[PDB]
Each structure stands twice: as structure tokens, then as C-alpha cells.
């Protein structure tokens, strides 16, 4: 959720940054280049191309990544995993990369039917059904909130004629929200009491749907379908037959797949055998787009004995688009803070809004944020319900920055490791 | 096809429209792809009754109820052909309110899927439907869907054409749509269209008024 | 886009809005022999200036209207009307122009509004036809101007029905437009404009208050429905609506009452806040409708609602005493009301009974709210008032005008209760009166029984 606020690159139609759209601060040149890349994508020119972000650490360039993910579409799949996360004990590297890719592709699987859901005593005015339309009015049945004034659908009679008088009525009877009902495609029905069997003690729970309807996808990722079809390390025959399954699904037009975008960071964690997979993987039929982010300089490629910029093999480097920009200033950081502040739903004095940035701007964005909640708890303690400098600085008793965290504690180390 | 030939339509064809009522029953069994064939049959059939169609008008009414059901259960291209055929008649303009529910089926189509298929139909359907039907209220509803298609939906010549049918409605809605704006390629096209009537004569009108007064 | 350039223009036209026009009006008045040249000249002049045309029309219309109101549109009045009509027709076409046109249209209507005022001889009819076209092509905002339309609605309702109902059909469509969709495309709430439409609904209630067509009823219902179920709250319109509700409910099929009932419970809370803003209207209305049912004595479900409303009357009285209160004033009001209702059959019954109802309510609650020997002062007079209720009604009630004993019972009960909760305090002259009146009535056994029991 460290990027919930993000909504996209935030530029005009002429590829110019309105500097605050979508909730992204400053960082002009980066967003601009990212927009150019967005274009490149929308014309398939990124075929046999990828883009690498030469970031500065302690900043998590993921921001612009998520932004591009948004600006591509509403729900374009987007996964971000760490380069080091491929050396598992269980999964092979191939297994891991394949899982990532099949986790970067989605589908469109919607369907149709009609039946209500709800919970009320089995004395129903909709136990009969007039037909298509409201047939209820300001009908008032028992829910846990209040009575209702609403409209209903068509097929409500038979099911309640099917509904026997049960001890426990989370069954298709009525609606009592207050506003609106209908049938909808539920088919998620049985005859059952309104409770389950709990761990410590056992009590009753008055519950139940108010309504129910969905033209469903609710399963959208190539990787999702797989664990759907495994236990509640994946057998290939499952995958290919799933791929075989969808292979026709798409033909009818019933199903539609979209590319996504995948984001690795710390690419220098990989090795040649990993890259060799990618530049073969990417040139496939409909592979998603790829973005990478490092903060190392000239470096030895892992798995060999050679230097190369960022530790990337030349062949891959030639076919790349390199983007990079600056660490933050002050002004932005405050603005950056506010965003996360309001996202974290915290009462911060603009007085605090100085003592804190002067920490982060000196130390790092991704750490200062990491403190934000850590003050609310003493605000919960001091009853203060608001954060001036009063708190983080007070709990700067228990607070200190990265050099302080890393280095001065590395100096806490360098204190004693001297002996 | 015989009816198309015998299109002269004797009482044989009157009862062929009764056979089309039997074909409506054929359709019921859902006749599968054969109901699309039956739809064609009925289309012709419809074509006959064009003479008087009072009983036939009601024959068709019953039939149309069923037809509506057919294309609502949603029997694709079937519906397209049917729709047009149906339309070619008269007299329902409430049947088209049910057809507005069919255009409701026409939305969510956001793709870009395989071809203009369904859309083409709708596109085609539009002005034709618009010519008669004239639930202008739902004209606006329809228009919403139309607009989208027109904007960006692969087949632009169809959307444009669909919009041209909508253009014929010549609406406050027409001008509203125009004003509303779009990818504008098509909007400009339609806006340009966005005229066609002729009048004036700030003298002729006056004369007419005078004449009227005199008459009074 | 490019219509901002045009809106600037529309604004200007409005803003700016004349030799031609003057000439035209004057000459129109003075045309009586031969003048077509002048006529067409004028036309072209005030064609280039739609605003001018409209304005001219309006003023002319007004003067014309007064003089011609004195009649059923003979000769020149008719001429004028027709001229206007023709012009409009032509221009309506010509002037598929701006929103200057829109507001000018509003003005025109408004004159047409006044034309209808007495409904002329059809001039208004043709103006309505123009509107029908007009509104039929409108899809515009001009909310306020929509109000002139309000005037028009009223006008048509006063002139039989027919094409004004079609204009209702037009107006029905217009109401749909009030709660519509151009702004839906834009995308928002309003809420505030729902309340704007609730004011209109005040105008729709006036349409109801005229006569004919179930459309209004439907509308009302919908409006109210919409209005709540969300959670929306802001006061004055609610105060209004009620009045209207009451009115139509009285008028027929008591659906108004149902609406009102729901509203009322809600408002008892909601109107606790609304009485902070003085649900003065609410109070009066409440009383009115309470009595309306009370006259009917009791409309079951509505009556059931009203038994609960007797309880809610008490509830809201804890607030209507803030509106108006205490022993002295209570009694005064009661007496006045009594006299009034006595001197007034059904509605006088209503007045007096309302008071009692209020009075009776008050009585049991005031057994609960207070005094002992100071109570007596009012008590005897309360008893007196109770006796006086029967004095003013009872047999008066027994002939025509429609209330009930219920009150009697109520009062008795409350008093009894408090009193007994102690024991015997304080009865006295109030009690004297009580026994007397009890006896007086002796109808029927129920009440008599009650009396005796209370006494003992």
C-alpha cells in the first residue's frame, strides 16, 4: 500500500507535467521520459526493447513504475519483485521467472445469470414474485441494520417456495438495506444457518448478504488460474492445458487477455543465466513490458568475471532505454510527506512538516515515511490526537535517522568493534 | 424465397404469413442456426403482409414478442437481420423500447475484439431503427451508445454511418452531441453534416402571417 | 470549446438587450389600414437581434394583455397574438442561437404565462405549442426560467386540462429534466439541486393544489423517496413538502398521509433539528394533519401511525412547548380554539379537537411535568377546559364534525397516573368538575366506567 496514492504519470495531452496530477510530485524529466515510453508502447515499437531506471536508492523508483502501470490502463497487471527473490530453496530460477510472467498477464471471463441473496426470517413478501420490476416498494423486512425502501427483480417466488422453514436463514429470502435490491447472478446459495463453528468459544452471528450480483471475472491472472487448479512448484501439464484451455476461451470472444508490466529492482542480483532467459523470454509472442531499476554503478556481472555498466550484459544494454533523475529537494519532500500523511490519516502540524523532512531529506524518503505511524502510537499514548514536532522529536528519543540507523549504529558497532 | 417471388402475395402469402407464425413457433424450439434461417424466412414474410397487416400486424405483434425473446435470449446475427426486417414495418415503437434493452446488450462492448460484427449490425440498425421506432426518448439512450462506438471502435465508417443515422434525428440532442465533442474526426464529419434544411425569407413569412390574419 | 466564443456572444446579447423595435410596436398598434413594408422591415431588423425581438414582444404583450384581458381576444388583440406567434415560429427556427435565446424564451413564456393568466382565447394555447416545440428542443438549464414554467403549469391547471396537460406531459417531461442528465454526463450530486427541485416540488405541490393528473402524485412520491434513503438533511424544504403532502393527502387516496407518517418519525428526530431551526411550519402542519386524520378518526394504519403520533406529539411537544407553552397559555389557546371550533362545525371541530388533543396529550405529560397545589390553579381550569371541550363540542360534536372521547380518556389517565403514584393529590375543584362532566356525558358505559374508577 506504499503507493496507493499513485494514480499515474500526470501529464497533459502534449506530454507536459502538470506537476501534481495523479498525485506525483516534481520529478519532471523522469515523468516526461516515461510518457515518451508510454507512447512507444502504444505503437508496439517497444518490440525487442525494455527500459531501465538508473535510480538513487532510499527512494524506491517504483513510484514511476506504478504510475506507468496506471497510465496504461485501469487494471493492467503489474508485479514488482526483487532480483534476489529468484534464488529460492524450492522453486527453480526458471520456475520463478515463469511464475512472474504468468503473474503479469490477465483475462476477461464474465458471465450471466440472476438470483438474489439475503438474510431475513422466512416470512417473505417476495416469497411470491409478481415479475420483472420492483414488486416490493418500501417493503420492510428484518436485517441487522433497519427496514428498507427499495425495488426487487423477477424470479423471487419459487426459491422461497423452495425455501423450507429453516433454523438459520442465510438463504434467498429478501433485502433490507434501505435503498435497493435485485436478483443478480449469485448462484452462491445453499440452505444453511447464519453461523459457523469458532475456535475458543461458540456464539451465534446475525449476518447475511444484503444483495448479490456480479458479471464475474474475479480470477484474473495467468498465474491465478494455476493455483486455482492446484492444492489449496507447479506441474507443467496443468499450465499448458490451462494455456490449452484458454487457447480456445479467447477464440469465442468469451475471454480476453491483456499484457501487463513487470518490474524488477536490484538487477545486479541476477546472473547471466537469468538474463539469457529474458532476452529470449521477452521476444516471445505477447510478453508484457519490462522495467528494471538499479542503483549500482559500473559493476561485475554476477556469475562471471567482467565489468559492465550496472552489471548488465552488453547485448541487453544496447537494446535498452535508460531513464534517470535527481534525488529530492526539500519542497517536494514536504509535499511528498503530506501525501503519505493524509493517506495514513494522521494529524500533522505543518510545524512537524519541517522537523521531519529535514530528517528525510538529509536521510531518505523511504525511511522518514517508515516513521510516520511510529508517532501515532505515542499520540495514542499522549492522547494528543495530532502530530506537531511535539511527538516524533519527543520520540526522537526513540527515533534517529539512517546514518544514525545504519551508520551511527554501524558506529554503535564501530564503537565496540573497535575492540 | 418463394414468398419473395410470389411477393405479389395472394391469400397463399397471407397464410404464408400464417406459416411465418408457424415459423415463429419453429423459432421457439430455438431452431439453432436454422432460426436465423427462419428469421430470414419471417423477414420475407414480414415483407408480404406489407399490404395490410392488421391481423398480420397482430400476427407480427405476437411474433415480435417471441422475436424479442429470441434475440434477448440473444441469438446474435440473427437479431441483426431480424431487427432490420422487423423495423421495415410500422406500429410498435414500444417494441423498440424492448430493442433499447437490446442496445443495452450492445454496450460493455469496449473492445476492439475481432471485427465490427455485432457493432456493424447495430451501426446498420441505428438510422434504420431511427427512421421508424421514434421513441425519441430512447433515441437519446441509443445515441449514448452510438456516440461511443462512433468515437473509436475499429470500423469508423460504420460508427460514422451509425452516427449519420443519428444525425438524421437532427437533434437538440444532435447539436448537443456535436457540442459535446469527441475524437472529433468523426465529430467534424457529423458537425459538417450538422445542417441540411433551408428556410429564411424574412419577407415570405411576413406575407404568410398577413394572409393568415386576413383569413381570420 | 467554440461555444465559449458563442457564450461570450450570448452573454453580450443578454447584456446589451432599438429604433426598429420601437417603431414596430408603435406601428403594430397603429396598423389598421396598409403597412406590410414596415412590417417586414421590422422583422429583418429584429431577426438580426433575437433579443430585441423578444423584448419587444414581451413589453407589447404586457400592455396588450391588460387591455385585452378585459375581453376574449377579439380583433387587434388576436392580431397581436398571431403576429407574435408567427414571429416566434419563424425565429424559433432562425434563432436556434444561444442561451440568450434560452432566457429570452423564459421571458416569452413568462409573458405567455401572463397570457394564460386568464387564458385569453388560445393565444396562450399557441404559446404553449411553441413551448412544446421549445421545451421539446430545450435540453438546456435555465432553472429559474423553469419557474415561469411553474407559472405556466398553474395557468394550464386553471384552464380545464387538455393541451396544458400535454404541456403537463410536456411539463412531466420537464420535471424529468429537472431531476435529469446533461449534468449527469458532466457528473455530480445536487442534493442541493434536488432541494432546488424540492422547492419546485413546492411548485409541483401547487400543481397538485390546482387539480387533474396522477403524474404529480407519482412525482411527489419519487421526489420524497429520492430525498431520503440516501441520508440527506438540510431542513426548510422538508418543512414545506409536508404542507403540500397534507394538502394532497386530504384531497384523496391518503398516500400523502403515508408519506407524511414516515417523514414525521424521521422528522421527530430530524425535526428536533428542524425545530432548532423552528419547525414552525412543521408544528402547524403536524397539528393540521393530525386533526385531519383525527377528523377521520383514525384511518387504521394511518390511525395506528397517529396513535404512535400521539406519543410523538408528546415527544415533539417537549419541543413545541419550546415553540409555545405552560399552564396559562395552554388553557388560553384551548379556550380560543374551543370557541372557534364550536362556531365552526367540521373545521371548528378540527380546531377545538386539535387543541384538546394537544390539551389531552399535554395533560398526561404535565401530570408527569409537575407541581402539586400550584398545579390545582391550572388543574381546575384544565378540568374546566376539558369540561369546556365538551361544552364547545360533545353534543356539538354529536351532531356534525368529527373527533372523539379518546381525548377524555387520555387526559383522565395521565392525571390519574401521576396522582395515584402518590395517592390522592390534588383533585379538588378540577375533580368536582370532572365528576360533573362525567355524569353529564353518561355516554357510554365505557367512559362512565372509566370516570368512576378514576374517582375511586
Amino acid at each position: 500500500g506504499a503507493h496507493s496514492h499513485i494514480r499515474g504519470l500526470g501529464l497533459d495531452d502534449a506530454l507536459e507535467p502538470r506537476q501534481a496530477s495523479q498525485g506525483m510530485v516534481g520529478q519532471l524529466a523522469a515523468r516526461r521520459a516515461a510518457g515518451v515510453v508510454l507512447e512507444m508502447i502504444r505503437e508496439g515499437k517497444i518490440a525487442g526493447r525494455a527500459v531501465l531506471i538508473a535510480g538513487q536508492p532510499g527512494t524506491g523508483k517504483t513510484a514511476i513504475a506504478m504510475g506507468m502501470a496506471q497510465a496504461l490502463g485501469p487494471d493492467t497487471p503489474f508485479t514488482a519483485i526483487a532480483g534476489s527473490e529468484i534464488f529460492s530453496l524450492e522453486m527453480s530460477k526458471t520456475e520463478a521467472l515463469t511464475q512472474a510472467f504468468r503473474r503479469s498477464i490477465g483475462v476477461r471471463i464474465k458471465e450471466e445469470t440472476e438470483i438474489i441473496e439475503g438474510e431475513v426470517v422466512e416470512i417473505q413478501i417476495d416469497r411470491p414474485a409478481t415479475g420483472t420490476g420492483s414488486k416490493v416498494g418500501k417493503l420492510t423486512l428484518k436485517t441487522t441494520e433497519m427496514e428498507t425502501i427499495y425495488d426487487l427483480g423477477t424470479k423471487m417466488i419459487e426459491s422461497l417456495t423452495k425455501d423450507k422453514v429453516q433454523a438459520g436463514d442465510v438463504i434467498t429470502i429478501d433485502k433490507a438495506t434501505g435503498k435497493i435490491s435485485k436478483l443478480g447472478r449469485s448462484f452462491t446459495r445453499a440452505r444453511d444457518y447464519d453461523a459457523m463453528g469458532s475456535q475458543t468459544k461458540f456464539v451465534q452471528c446475525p449476518d447475511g448478504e444484503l444483495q448479490k450480483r456480479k458479471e464475474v471475472v474475479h480470477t484474473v491472472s495467468l498465474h491465478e488460474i494455476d493455483v486455482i487448479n492446484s492444492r489449496t512448484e507447479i506441474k507443467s501439464e496443468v499450465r499448458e492445458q490451462i494455456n490449452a484451455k484458454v487457447a480456445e476461451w479467447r477464440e469465442e470472444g468469451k475471454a480476453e487477455i491483456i499484457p501487463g508490466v513487470l518490474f524488477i529492482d536490484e538487477v545486479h542480483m541476477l546472473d547471466i543465466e537469468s538474463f539469457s532467459f529474458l532476452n529470449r523470454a521477452l521476444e516471445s509472442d505477447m510478453a508484457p513490458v519490462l522495467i528494471m531499476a538499479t542503483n549500482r554503478g559500473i559493476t561485475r556481472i554476477r556469475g562471471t568475471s567482467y565489468q559492465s555498466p550496472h552489471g548488465i550484459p552488453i547485448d541487453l544494454l544496447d537494446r535498452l532505454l535508460i531513464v534517470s533523475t535527481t534525488p529530492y529537494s526539500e519542497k517536494d519532500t514536504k509535499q511528498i510527506l503530506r501525501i503519505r500523511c493524509e493517506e495514513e490519516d494522521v494529524e500533522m502540524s505543518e510545524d512537524a512538516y519541517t522537523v521531519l523532512t529535514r530528517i528525510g531529506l538529509e536521510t531518505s524518503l523511504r525511511y522518514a515515511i517508515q516513521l510516520i505511524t511510529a508517532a501515532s502510537l505515542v499520540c495514542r499514548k499522549r492522547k494528543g490526537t495530532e502530530v506537531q514536532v511535539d511527538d516524533i522529536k519527543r520520540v526522537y528519543s526513540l527515533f534517529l535517522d539512517e546514518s544514525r540507523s545504519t551508520q551511527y549504529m554501524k558506529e554503535y558497532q564501530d564503537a565496540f568493534l573497535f575492540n | 424465397x418463394x414468398x419473395x417471388x410470389x411477393x405479389x402475395x395472394x391469400x397463399x402469402x397471407x397464410x404464408x404469413x400464417x406459416x411465418x407464425x408457424x415459423x415463429x413457433x419453429x423459432x421457439x424450439x430455438x431452431x439453432x442456426x436454422x432460426x436465423x434461417x427462419x428469421x430470414x424466412x419471417x423477414x420475407x414474410x414480414x415483407x408480404x403482409x406489407x399490404x395490410x397487416x392488421x391481423x398480420x400486424x397482430x400476427x407480427x405483434x405476437x411474433x415480435x414478442x417471441x422475436x424479442x425473446x429470441x434475440x434477448x435470449x440473444x441469438x446474435x446475427g440473427x437479431x441483426x437481420x431480424x431487427x432490420x426486417x422487423x423495423x421495415x414495418x410500422x406500429x410498435x415503437x414500444x417494441x423498440x423500447x424492448x430493442x433499447x434493452x437490446x442496445x443495452x446488450x450492445x454496450x460493455x462492448x469496449x473492445x476492439x475484439x475481432x471485427x465490427x460484427x455485432x457493432x456493424x449490425x447495430x451501426x446498420x440498425x441505428x438510422x434504420x431503427x431511427x427512421x421508424x421506432x421514434x421513441x425519441x426518448x430512447x433515441x437519446x439512450x441509443x445515441x449514448x451508445x452510438x456516440x461511443x462506438x462512433x468515437x473509436x471502435x475499429x470500423x469508423x465508417x460504420x460508427x460514422x454511418x451509425x452516427x449519420x443515422x443519428x444525425x438524421x434525428x437532427x437533434x437538440x440532442x444532435x447539436x448537443x452531441x456535436x457540442x459535446x465533442x469527441x475524437x472529433x474526426x468523426x465529430x467534424x464529419x457529423x458537425x459538417x453534416x450538422x445542417x441540411x434544411x433551408x428556410x429564411x425569407x424574412x419577407x415570405x413569412x411576413x406575407x404568410x402571417x398577413x394572409x393568415x390574419x386576413x383569413x381570420x | 470549446x467554440x461555444x465559449x466564443x458563442x457564450x461570450x456572444x450570448x452573454x453580450x446579447x443578454x447584456x446589451x438587450x432599438x429604433x426598429x423595435x420601437x417603431x414596430x410596436x408603435x406601428x403594430x398598434x397603429x396598423x389598421x389600414x396598409x403597412x406590410x413594408x414596415x412590417x417586414x422591415x421590422x422583422x429583418x431588423x429584429x431577426x438580426x437581434x433575437x433579443x430585441x425581438x423578444x423584448x419587444x414582444x414581451x413589453x407589447x404583450x404586457x400592455x396588450x394583455x391588460x387591455x385585452x384581458x378585459x375581453x376574449x381576444x377579439x380583433x387587434x388583440x388576436x392580431x397581436x397574438x398571431x403576429x407574435x406567434x408567427x414571429x416566434x415560429x419563424x425565429x424559433x427556427x432562425x434563432x436556434x442561437x444561444x442561451x440568450x435565446x434560452x432566457x429570452x424564451x423564459x421571458x416569452x413564456x413568462x409573458x405567455x404565462x401572463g397570457x394564460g393568466x386568464x387564458x385569453x382565447x388560445x393565444x396562450x394555447x399557441x404559446x404553449x405549442x411553441x413551448x412544446x416545440x421549445x421545451x421539446x428542443x430545450x435540453x438546456x438549464x435555465g432553472x429559474x426560467x423553469x419557474x415561469x414554467x411553474x407559472x405556466x403549469x398553474x395557468x394550464x391547471x386553471x384552464x380545464x386540462x387538455x393541451x396544458x396537460x400535454x404541456x403537463x406531459x410536456x411539463x412531466x417531461x420537464x420535471x424529468x429534466x429537472x431531476x435529469x442528465x446533461x449534468x449527469x454526463x458532466x457528473x455530480x450530486x445536487x442534493x442541493x439541486x434536488x432541494x432546488x427541485x424540492x422547492x419546485x416540488x413546492x411548485x409541483x405541490x401547487x400543481x397538485x393544489x390546482x387539480x387533474x393528473x396522477x403524474x404529480x402524485x407519482x412525482x411527489x412520491x419519487x421526489x420524497x423517496x429520492x430525498x431520503x434513503x440516501x441520508x440527506x438533511x438540510x431542513x426548510x424544504x422538508x418543512x414545506x413538502x409536508x404542507x403540500x403532502x397534507x394538502x394532497x393527502x386530504x384531497x384523496x387516496x391518503x398516500x400523502x398521509x403515508x408519506x407524511x407518517x414516515x417523514x414525521x418519525x424521521x422528522x421527530x428526530x430530524x425535526x428536533x433539528x428542524x425545530x432548532x431551526x423552528x419547525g414552525x411550519x412543521x408544528x402547524x402542519x403536524x397539528x393540521x394533519x393530525x386533526x385531519x386524520x383525527x377528523x377521520x378518526x383514525x384511518x387504521x394504519x394511518x390511525x395506528x401511525x397517529x396513535x404512535x403520533x400521539x406519543x410523538x406529539x408528546x415527544x415533539x411537544x417537549x419541543x413545541x412547548x419550546x415553540x409555545x407553552x405552560x399552564x396559562x397559555x395552554x388553557x388560553x389557546x384551548x379556550x380560543x380554539x374551543x370557541x372557534x371550533x364550536x362556531x365552526x362545525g367540521x373545521x371548528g371541530x378540527x380546531x377545538x379537537x386539535x387543541x384538546x388533543x394537544x390539551x389531552x396529550x399535554x395533560x398526561x405529560x404535565x401530570x408527569x411535568x409537575x407541581x402539586x397545589x400550584x398545579x390545582x390553579x391550572x388543574x381546575x381550569x384544565x378540568x374546566x377546559x376539558x369540561x369546556x371541550x365538551x361544552x364547545x363540542x360533545x353534543x356539538x360534536x354529536x351532531x356534525x364534525x368529527x373527533x372523539x372521547x379518546x381525548x377524555x380518556x387520555x387526559x383522565x389517565x395521565x392525571x390519574x397516573x401521576x396522582x395515584x403514584x402518590x395517592x390522592x393529590x390534588x383533585x379538588x375543584x378540577x375533580x368536582x368538575x370532572x365528576x360533573x362532566x362525567x355524569x353529564x356525558x353518561x355516554x357510554x358505559x365505557x367512559x362512565x366506567x372509566x370516570x368512576x374508577x378514576x374517582x375511586x
Binding site: 524450492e90 475456535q199 540507523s405 545504519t406 551508520q407 558506529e411 554503535y412 558497532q413 565496540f416 568493534l417 | - | -
Partner: protein, 65 residues
Amino acid sequence: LLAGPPGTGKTALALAIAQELGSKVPFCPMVGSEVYSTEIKKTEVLMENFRRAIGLRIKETKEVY
């Protein structure tokens, strides 16, 4: 990315954290060297020490005199 604890008396605190989070919760301390075992391999001991650290509060009903 940080630094920290030298010398003595750390695990005391781990066990402290153990007691306060309710009584009798799982606490299985292990050293990093465990995984480099020749008999069994890593994943084994890893999952083992995990399911060492999972508490089940089994509530049972007994027929008592």
C-alpha cells in the same frame, strides 16, 4: 539496512516478548548454523523450526467426576 546488538543478554528480550503476548505461546530459538546440516537439508530444518513456532489452543470437553 541498519546496525545493532553486541555481546550478551539479547535472547532474554525475545523470551520477554514471548511471555507478554499471552501465556504459553511458541518460542523456539535457533542459531543460524542449524541449516548447514549434512543429514537433512535446509528446507527440512527451516519448515521444522517454523512449525515449531505455531500455537494451537485446543479446547477440549471432558466428562468429569
